[PDB]
């Protein structure tokens with residue numbers, strides 16, 4: 511939401527204004543927390559229940575480091591696209 515006045519209970523919250531780097535395995539599906547509520551960031555732990563928000567599945571083609579979005583405002587979820595810098 512562009513509006514800055516209020517947090518609505520269905521809005522994502524920032525976990526941190528910085529990515530969560532994670533070494534990922536090729537072909538394994540990761541479930542990114544889109545809501546900011548998970549206690550196991552950057553991954554969903556079911557805490558989204560009650561907000562209407564939902565995790566995003568991410569299956570990398572190859573092994574490497576994925577910089578998952580921590581601020582929850584990336585325009586290219588689930589990965590950091592730098593939006594945290596201006597959020």
Ligand code: FES
Nearest residue numbers: 543544554557558
């Ligand atoms: S805990 Fe945040 S999307 Fe599931």
Ligand code: FES
Nearest residue numbers: 579580581590593
């Ligand atoms: S942590 Fe969200 S865009 Fe970088």
